[PDB]
Short mmCIF file of C-alpha atoms and ligand atoms in Angstrom, two decimals:
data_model
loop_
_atom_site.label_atom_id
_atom_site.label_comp_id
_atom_site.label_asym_id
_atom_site.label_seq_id
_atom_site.Cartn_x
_atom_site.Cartn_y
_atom_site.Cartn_z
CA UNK A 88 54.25 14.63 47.08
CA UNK A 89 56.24 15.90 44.22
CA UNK A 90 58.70 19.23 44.68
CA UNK A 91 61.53 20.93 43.66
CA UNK A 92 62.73 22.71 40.17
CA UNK A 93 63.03 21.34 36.87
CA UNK A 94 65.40 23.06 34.44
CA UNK A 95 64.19 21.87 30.75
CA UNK A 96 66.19 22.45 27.46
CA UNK A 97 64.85 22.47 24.33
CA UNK A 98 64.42 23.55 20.41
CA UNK A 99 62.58 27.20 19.98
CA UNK A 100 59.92 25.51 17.98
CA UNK A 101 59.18 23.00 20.99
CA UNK A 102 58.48 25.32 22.96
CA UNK A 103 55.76 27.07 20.97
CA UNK A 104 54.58 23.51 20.50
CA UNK A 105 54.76 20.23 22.40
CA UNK A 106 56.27 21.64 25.91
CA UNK A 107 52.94 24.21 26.52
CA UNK A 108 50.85 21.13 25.56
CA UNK A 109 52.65 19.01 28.06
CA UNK A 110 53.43 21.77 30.59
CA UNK A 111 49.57 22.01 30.99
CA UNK A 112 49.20 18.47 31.90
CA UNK A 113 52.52 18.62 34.44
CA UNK A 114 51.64 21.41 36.07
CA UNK A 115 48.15 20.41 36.86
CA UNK A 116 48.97 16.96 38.27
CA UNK A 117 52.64 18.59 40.15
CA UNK A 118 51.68 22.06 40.72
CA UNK A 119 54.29 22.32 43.61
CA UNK A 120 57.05 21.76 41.08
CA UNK A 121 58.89 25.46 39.86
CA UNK A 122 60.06 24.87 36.29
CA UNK A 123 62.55 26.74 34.22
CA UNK A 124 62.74 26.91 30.31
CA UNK A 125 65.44 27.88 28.04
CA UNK A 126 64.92 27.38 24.76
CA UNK A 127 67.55 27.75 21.78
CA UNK A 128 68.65 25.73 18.71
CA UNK A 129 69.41 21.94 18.86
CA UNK A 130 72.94 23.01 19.14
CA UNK A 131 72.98 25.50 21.49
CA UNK A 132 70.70 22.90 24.08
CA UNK A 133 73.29 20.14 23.49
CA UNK A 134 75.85 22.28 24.20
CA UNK A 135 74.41 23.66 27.54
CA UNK A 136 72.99 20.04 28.60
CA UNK A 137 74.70 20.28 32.15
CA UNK A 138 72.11 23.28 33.23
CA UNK A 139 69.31 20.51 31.82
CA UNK A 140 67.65 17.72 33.75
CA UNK A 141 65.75 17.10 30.50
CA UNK A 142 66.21 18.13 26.95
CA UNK A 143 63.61 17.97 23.91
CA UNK A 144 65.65 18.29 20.75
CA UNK A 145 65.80 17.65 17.01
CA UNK A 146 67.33 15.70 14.41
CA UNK A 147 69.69 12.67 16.20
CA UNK A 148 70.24 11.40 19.40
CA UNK A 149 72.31 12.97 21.95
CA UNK A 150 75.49 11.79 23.28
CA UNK A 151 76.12 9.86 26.46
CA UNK A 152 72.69 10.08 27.15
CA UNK A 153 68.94 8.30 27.65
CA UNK A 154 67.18 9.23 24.62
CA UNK A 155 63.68 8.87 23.83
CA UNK A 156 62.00 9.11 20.62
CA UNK A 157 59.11 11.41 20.97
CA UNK A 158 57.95 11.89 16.77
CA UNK A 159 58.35 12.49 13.44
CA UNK A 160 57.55 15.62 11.29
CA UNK A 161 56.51 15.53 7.70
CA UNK A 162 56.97 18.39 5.99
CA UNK A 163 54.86 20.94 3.47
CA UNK A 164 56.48 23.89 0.80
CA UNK A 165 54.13 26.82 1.32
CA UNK A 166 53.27 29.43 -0.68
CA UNK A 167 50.55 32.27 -1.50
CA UNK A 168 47.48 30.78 -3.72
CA UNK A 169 47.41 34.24 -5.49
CA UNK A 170 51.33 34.16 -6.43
CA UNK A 171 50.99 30.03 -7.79
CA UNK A 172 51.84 30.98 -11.26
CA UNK A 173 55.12 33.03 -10.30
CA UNK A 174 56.22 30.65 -7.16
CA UNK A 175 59.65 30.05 -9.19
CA UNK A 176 60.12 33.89 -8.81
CA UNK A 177 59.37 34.46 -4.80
CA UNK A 178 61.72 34.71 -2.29
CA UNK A 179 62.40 31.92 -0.43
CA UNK A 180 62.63 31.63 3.28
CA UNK A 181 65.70 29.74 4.94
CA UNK A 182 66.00 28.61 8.86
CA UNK A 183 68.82 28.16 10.46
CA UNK A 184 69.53 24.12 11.20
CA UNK A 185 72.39 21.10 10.69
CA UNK A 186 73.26 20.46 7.30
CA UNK A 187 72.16 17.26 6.66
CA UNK A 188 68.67 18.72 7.57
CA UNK A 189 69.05 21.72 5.62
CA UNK A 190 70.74 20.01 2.37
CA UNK A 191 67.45 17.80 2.09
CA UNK A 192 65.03 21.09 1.68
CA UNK A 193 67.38 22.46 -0.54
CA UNK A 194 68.00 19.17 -3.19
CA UNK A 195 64.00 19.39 -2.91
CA UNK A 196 63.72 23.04 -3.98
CA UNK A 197 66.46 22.33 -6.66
CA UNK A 198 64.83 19.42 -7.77
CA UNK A 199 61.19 20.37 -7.47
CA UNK A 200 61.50 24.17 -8.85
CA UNK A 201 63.84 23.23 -11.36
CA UNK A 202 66.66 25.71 -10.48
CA UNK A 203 69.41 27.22 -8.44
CA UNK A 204 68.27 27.10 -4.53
CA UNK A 205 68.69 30.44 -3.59
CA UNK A 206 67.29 32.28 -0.15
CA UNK A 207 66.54 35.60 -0.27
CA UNK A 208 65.37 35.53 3.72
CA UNK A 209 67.66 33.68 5.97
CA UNK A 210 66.38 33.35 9.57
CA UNK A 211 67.44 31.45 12.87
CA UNK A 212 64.31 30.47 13.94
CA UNK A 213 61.50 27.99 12.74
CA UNK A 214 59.03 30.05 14.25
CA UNK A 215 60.47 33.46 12.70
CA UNK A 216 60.22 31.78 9.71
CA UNK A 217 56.50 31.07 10.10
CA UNK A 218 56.24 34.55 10.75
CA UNK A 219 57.86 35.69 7.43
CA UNK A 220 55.65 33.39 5.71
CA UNK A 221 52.10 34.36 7.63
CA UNK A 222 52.86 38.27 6.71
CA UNK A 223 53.07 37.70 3.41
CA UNK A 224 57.73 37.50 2.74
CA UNK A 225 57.06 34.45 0.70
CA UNK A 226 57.78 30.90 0.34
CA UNK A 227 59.04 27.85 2.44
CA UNK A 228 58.87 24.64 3.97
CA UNK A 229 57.89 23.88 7.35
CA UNK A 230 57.41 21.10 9.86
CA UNK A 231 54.38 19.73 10.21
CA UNK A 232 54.46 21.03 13.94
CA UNK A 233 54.77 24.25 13.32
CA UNK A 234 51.58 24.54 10.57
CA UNK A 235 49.15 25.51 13.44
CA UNK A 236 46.73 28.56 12.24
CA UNK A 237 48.34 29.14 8.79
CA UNK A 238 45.55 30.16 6.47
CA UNK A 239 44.12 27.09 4.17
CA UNK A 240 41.93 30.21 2.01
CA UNK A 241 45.75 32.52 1.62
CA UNK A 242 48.28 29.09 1.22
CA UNK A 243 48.65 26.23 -0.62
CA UNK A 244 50.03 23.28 1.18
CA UNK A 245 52.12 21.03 -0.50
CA UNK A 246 53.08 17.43 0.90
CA UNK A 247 57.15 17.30 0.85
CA UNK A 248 58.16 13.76 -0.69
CA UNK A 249 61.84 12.70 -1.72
CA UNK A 250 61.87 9.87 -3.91
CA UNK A 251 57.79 9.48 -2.80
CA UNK A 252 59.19 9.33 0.78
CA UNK A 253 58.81 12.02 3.36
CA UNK A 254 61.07 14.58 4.13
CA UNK A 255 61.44 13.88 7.80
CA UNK A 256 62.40 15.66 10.97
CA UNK A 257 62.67 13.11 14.53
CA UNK A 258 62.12 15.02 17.84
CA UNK A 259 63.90 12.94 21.09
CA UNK A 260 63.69 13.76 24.69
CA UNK A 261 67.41 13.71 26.51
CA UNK A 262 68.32 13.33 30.05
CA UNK A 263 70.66 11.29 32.27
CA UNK A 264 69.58 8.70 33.71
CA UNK A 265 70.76 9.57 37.16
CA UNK A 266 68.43 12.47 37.21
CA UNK A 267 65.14 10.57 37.23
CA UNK A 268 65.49 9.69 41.08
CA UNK A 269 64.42 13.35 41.22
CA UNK A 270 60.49 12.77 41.48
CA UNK A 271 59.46 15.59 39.57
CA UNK A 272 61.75 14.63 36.76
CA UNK A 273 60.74 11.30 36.73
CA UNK A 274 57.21 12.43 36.69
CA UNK A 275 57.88 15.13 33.71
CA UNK A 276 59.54 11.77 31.55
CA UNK A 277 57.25 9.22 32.69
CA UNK A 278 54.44 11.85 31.47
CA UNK A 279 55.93 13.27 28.22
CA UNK A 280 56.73 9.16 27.31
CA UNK A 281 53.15 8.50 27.59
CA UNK A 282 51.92 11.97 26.01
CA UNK A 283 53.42 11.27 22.74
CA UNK A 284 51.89 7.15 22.89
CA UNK B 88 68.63 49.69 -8.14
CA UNK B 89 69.26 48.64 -4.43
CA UNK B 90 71.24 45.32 -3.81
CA UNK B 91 73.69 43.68 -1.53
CA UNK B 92 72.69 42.05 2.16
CA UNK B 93 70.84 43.63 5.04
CA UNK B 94 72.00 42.34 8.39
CA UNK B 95 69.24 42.49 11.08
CA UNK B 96 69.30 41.81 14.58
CA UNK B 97 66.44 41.92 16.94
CA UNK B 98 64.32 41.30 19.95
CA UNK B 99 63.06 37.45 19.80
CA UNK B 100 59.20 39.19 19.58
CA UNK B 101 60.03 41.57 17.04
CA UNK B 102 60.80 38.74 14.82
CA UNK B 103 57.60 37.41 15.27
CA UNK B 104 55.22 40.49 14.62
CA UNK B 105 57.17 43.97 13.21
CA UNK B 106 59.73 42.45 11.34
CA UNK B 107 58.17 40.16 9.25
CA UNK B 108 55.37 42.99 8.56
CA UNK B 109 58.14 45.46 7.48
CA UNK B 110 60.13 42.78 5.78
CA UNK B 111 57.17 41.73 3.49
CA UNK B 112 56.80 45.34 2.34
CA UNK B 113 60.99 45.86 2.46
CA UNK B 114 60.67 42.62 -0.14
CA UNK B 115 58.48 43.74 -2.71
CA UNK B 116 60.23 47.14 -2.94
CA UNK B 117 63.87 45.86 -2.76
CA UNK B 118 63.36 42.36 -4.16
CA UNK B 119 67.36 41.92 -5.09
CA UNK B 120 68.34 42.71 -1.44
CA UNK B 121 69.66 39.30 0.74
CA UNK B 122 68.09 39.62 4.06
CA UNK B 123 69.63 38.00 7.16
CA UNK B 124 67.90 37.90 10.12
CA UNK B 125 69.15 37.02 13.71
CA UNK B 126 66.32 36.88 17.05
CA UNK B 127 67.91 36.87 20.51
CA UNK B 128 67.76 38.99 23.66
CA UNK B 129 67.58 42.75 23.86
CA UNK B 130 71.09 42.21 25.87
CA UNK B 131 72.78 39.65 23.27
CA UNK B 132 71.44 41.66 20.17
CA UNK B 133 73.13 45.24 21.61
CA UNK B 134 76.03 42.46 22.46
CA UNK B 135 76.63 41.53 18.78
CA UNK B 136 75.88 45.22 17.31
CA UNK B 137 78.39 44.80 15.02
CA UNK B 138 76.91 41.85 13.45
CA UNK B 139 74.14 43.96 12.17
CA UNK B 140 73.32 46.81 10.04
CA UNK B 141 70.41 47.58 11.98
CA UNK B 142 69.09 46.51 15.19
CA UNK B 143 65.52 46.56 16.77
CA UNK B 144 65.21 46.47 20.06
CA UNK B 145 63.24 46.92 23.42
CA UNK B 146 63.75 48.82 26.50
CA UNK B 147 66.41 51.80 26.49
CA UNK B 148 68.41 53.44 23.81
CA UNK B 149 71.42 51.70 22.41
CA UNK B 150 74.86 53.00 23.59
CA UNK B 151 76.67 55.33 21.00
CA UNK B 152 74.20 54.69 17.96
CA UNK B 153 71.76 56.52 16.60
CA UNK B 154 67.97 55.84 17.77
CA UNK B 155 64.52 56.13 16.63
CA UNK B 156 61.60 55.24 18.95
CA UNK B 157 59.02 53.09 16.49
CA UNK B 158 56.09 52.09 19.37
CA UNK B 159 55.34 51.40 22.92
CA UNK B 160 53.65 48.73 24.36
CA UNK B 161 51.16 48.69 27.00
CA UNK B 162 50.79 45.40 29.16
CA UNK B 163 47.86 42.81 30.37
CA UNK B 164 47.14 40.60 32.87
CA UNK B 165 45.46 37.54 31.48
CA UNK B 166 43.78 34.72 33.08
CA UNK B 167 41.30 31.89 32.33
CA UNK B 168 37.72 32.89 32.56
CA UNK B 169 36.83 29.96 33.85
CA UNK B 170 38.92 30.21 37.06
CA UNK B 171 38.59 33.81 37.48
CA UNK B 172 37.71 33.18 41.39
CA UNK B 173 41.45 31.24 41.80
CA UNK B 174 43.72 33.67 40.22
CA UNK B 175 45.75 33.87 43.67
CA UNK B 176 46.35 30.74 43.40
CA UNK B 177 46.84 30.16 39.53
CA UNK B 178 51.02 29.38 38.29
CA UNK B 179 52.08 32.71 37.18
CA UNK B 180 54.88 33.02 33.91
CA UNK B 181 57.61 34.79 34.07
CA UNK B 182 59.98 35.94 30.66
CA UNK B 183 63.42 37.03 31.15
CA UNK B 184 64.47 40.47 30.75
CA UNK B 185 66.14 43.69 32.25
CA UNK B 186 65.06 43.92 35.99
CA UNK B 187 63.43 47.57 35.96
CA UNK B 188 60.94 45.92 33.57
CA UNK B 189 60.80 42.69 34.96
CA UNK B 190 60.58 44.35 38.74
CA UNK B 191 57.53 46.53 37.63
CA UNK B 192 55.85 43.25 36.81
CA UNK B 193 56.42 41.92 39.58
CA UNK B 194 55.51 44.95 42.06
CA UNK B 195 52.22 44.93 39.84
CA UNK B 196 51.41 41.59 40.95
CA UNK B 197 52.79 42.06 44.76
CA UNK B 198 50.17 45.01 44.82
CA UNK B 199 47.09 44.20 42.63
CA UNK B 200 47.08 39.72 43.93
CA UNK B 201 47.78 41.06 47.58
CA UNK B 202 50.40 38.69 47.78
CA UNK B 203 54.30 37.82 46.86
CA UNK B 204 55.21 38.03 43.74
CA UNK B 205 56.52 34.17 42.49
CA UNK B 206 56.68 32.80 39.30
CA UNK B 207 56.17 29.04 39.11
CA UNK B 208 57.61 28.68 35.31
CA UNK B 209 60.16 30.88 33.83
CA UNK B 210 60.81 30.92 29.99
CA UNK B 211 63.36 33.34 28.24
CA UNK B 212 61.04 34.46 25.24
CA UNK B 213 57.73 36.21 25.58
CA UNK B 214 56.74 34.05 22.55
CA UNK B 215 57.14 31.16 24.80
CA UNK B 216 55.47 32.60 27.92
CA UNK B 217 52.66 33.59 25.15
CA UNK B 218 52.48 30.00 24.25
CA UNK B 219 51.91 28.49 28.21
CA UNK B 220 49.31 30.79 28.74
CA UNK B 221 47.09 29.81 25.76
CA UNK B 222 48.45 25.95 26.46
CA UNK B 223 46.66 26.61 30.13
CA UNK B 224 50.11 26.73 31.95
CA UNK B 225 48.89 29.85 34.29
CA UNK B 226 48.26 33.53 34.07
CA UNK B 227 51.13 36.33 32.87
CA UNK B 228 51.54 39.93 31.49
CA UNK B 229 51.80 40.46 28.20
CA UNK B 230 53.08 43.45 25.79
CA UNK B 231 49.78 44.64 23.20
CA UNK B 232 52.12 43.69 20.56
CA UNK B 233 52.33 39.87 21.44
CA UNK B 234 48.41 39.66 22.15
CA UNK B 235 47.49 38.60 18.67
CA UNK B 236 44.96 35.48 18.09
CA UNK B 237 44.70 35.15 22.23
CA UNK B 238 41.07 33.83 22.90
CA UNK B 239 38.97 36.32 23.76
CA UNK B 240 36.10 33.77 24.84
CA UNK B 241 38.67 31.81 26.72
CA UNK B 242 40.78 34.85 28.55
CA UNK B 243 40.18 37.95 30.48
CA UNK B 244 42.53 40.85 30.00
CA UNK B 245 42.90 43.49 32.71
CA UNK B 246 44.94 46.49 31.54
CA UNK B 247 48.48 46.86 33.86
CA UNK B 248 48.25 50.22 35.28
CA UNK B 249 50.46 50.97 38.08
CA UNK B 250 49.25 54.71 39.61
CA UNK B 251 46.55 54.98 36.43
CA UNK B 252 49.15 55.12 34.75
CA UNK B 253 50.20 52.18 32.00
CA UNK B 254 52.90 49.89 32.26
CA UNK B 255 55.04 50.28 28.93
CA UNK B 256 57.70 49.01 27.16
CA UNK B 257 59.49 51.01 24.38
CA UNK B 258 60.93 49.73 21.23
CA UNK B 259 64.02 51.52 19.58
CA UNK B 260 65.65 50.83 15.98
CA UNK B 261 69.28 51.44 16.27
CA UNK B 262 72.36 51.53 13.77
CA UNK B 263 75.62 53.35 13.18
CA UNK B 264 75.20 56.48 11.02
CA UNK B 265 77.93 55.58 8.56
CA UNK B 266 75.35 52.52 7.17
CA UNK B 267 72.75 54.89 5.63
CA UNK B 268 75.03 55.41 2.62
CA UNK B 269 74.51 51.49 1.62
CA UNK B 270 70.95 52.00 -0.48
CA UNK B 271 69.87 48.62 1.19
CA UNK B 272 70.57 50.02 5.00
CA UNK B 273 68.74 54.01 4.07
CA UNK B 274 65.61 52.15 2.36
CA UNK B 275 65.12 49.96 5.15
CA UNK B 276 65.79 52.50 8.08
CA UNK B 277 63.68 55.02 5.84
CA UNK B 278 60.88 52.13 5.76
CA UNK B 279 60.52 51.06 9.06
CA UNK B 280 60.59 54.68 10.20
CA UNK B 281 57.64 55.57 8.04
CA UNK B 282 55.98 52.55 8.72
CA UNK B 283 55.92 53.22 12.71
CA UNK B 284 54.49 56.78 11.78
NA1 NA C 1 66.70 27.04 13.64
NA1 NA C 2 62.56 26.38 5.10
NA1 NA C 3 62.92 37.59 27.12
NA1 NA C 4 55.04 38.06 32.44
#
């Protein structure tokens, strides 16, 4: 019978996302298992991966480490359907991420809107971002993740291709593989492995 | 005509429900102001004060600014309908912050459940504790302000009252007087002040 504490790292977004989701499921089948969360950007997690049995992160792999490729994200530009004729004139919304990440949504906004990319919001946070965007700031791109309970009537959707290839964002789960003679870790990786299959 | 950058630091859940309503009025008013935005902890926020312009955050007054009160929150209890008969015995989550608050949550539960107070998962963020309880992770308090789009058919709320009187959090904008003279810094202060009201 499966005890003890489990100290998970991971991206903010995940854990609006994918870690409730598979929380649920741990919980239910472990529920003598005490679990502690931190979330923070990919950085900050990687950084701070000694307090972590597992980490859930995004972009590449992590160093010196069992990785696991959970999924991909596509990704959508979204914008107000009353404001479509004047979308080259609204603010656009920035998150904070790695370059490589961020240079691809901004060579899309260059090349798609046919000017200077310019953000008039900058914020750390994908799900801050979401915010911005719900309450009416104005434009960007999100994950696919992270498009939960945005209004279809208010907001166009549109599909974010490079080269008519997706703009993509990989999510991998981290840990060392010493820690999975822990039971309840093993159980939380053997479970989130098969959650995303 | 109002330009330059506006610095704001705040509470993570402020960023997810005042802030971007204020920011999507702030916008269309001010629409040549750059607006940065950074989410953390009450603690790290006051922490990094001089990052900011103007700060938004929860609990007590800042030290050695000046402070206007926007809102209080009052709290809830919330639980799955369907397992209303095995809240004693349902994972309860726990969000970091300050221990007065945190320690009336927790005497609320030690009095009302008839039992110790212990939290099977702890999260930093409210937004993420917000996000295991509509995953069906457990039960948890929440501030009004963060009960937005929580299923009414799926949840019961009990109001936190501890003496019939509520349990409340306040929440304080803060900045350094010698700000106001940059047009960007009054209009927003001036805005979010009236806003509140
Ligand atoms: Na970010
Ligand atoms: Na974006
Ligand atoms: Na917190
Ligand atoms: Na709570």
């Amino acid at each position: 019978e499966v005890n003890g504490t489990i100290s998970i790292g991971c991206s903010s977004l995940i854990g609006q996302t994918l870690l409730p989701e598979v929380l649920s499921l741990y919980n239910a089948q472990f529920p003598n298992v005490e679990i502690q969360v931190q979330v923070g950007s990919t950085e900050q997690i990687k950084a701070n991966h000694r307090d972590y049995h597992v980490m859930i992160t995004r972009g590449n792999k992590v160093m010196n480490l069992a990785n696991t490729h959970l999924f991909n994200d596509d990704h959508y530009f979204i914008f107000p359907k009353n404001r479509r004729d004047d979308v080259t004139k609204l603010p656009f919304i920035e998150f904070q991420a790695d370059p490589i990440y961020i240079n691809q949504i901004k060579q899309w906004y260059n090349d798609n809107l046919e000017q200077d990319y310019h953000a008039t919001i900058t914020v750390d946070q994908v799900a801050t971002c979401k915010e911005m965007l719900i309450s009416g700031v104005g434009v960007t791109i999100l994950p696919e993740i992270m498009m939960k309970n945005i209004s279809k009537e208010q907001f166009e959707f549109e599909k974010v291709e490079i080269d008519n290839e997706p703009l993509i964002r990989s999510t991998f789960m981290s840990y060392d593989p010493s820690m999975l003679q822990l039971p309840q870790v093993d159980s939380f990786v053997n479970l989130m492995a098969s959650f995303v299959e």
